[PDB]
Design a protein around this ligand. Structure first.
Ligand SMILES: CCCCc1ccccc1
Ligand SMILES: [Cl-]
Ligand SMILES: [Cl-]
Length: 162
């Protein structure tokens, strides 16, 4: 298992524009297009991302290309964040995948506002962090996904995904 497979499981793959759990226009493997309610704006953002007149539909290859770029941007966002970087550097490989997952889902901003959990993870207080991470809107809105990521941080294994 790895980050890509993990995210592919959590986000699914859709080749036509769709609304995410928050109701935002998305495509592919969790690639958010726009928070705007307008489908046209979403179609415009899509064509600009792909480099062609898509008409709201993309191929599997195109989806995977966006996905690769988004994973890379997520990591890079982490490494560029002064609050996040040190925590991430302190984690083992599996737990780093859990960190990427969260940033991919909620943005560096989102995740950067979990100070208490960050400190706990940095200290390797797994069970405590796990409890703290669950006291969040994120957990209450997407509990099954949050549970899988939380178990990953708690155990340092891919069990939740097997
Ligand atoms: C809980 C804080 C957000 C997830 C995260 C953890 C460590 C490093 C980067 C990102
Ligand atoms: Cl893009
Ligand atoms: Cl869920």
């Amino acid at each position: 298992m790895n980050i890509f497979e993990m995210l592919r499981i959590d986000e699914g793959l859709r080749l036509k524009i769709y609304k995410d759990t928050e109701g935002y226009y998305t495509i592919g493997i969790g690639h958010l297009l726009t928070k705007s309610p307008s489908l046209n704006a979403a179609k415009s953002e899509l064509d600009k991302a792909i480099g062609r007149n898509t008409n709201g539909v993309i191929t599997k290859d195109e989806a995977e290309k966006l996905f690769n770029q988004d994973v890379d941007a997520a990591v890079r966002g982490i490494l560029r964040n002064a609050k996040l970087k040190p925590v991430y550097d302190s984690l083992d490989a599996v737990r780093r995948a859990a960190a990427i997952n969260m940033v991919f889902q909620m943005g560096e901003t989102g995740v950067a506002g979990f100070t208490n959990s960050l400190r706990m993870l940095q200290q390797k207080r797994w069970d405590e962090a796990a409890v703290n991470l669950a006291k969040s809107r994120w957990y209450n809105q997407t509990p099954n996904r949050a549970k899988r990521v939380i178990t990953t941080f708690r155990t340092g294994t891919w069990d939740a995904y097997k």
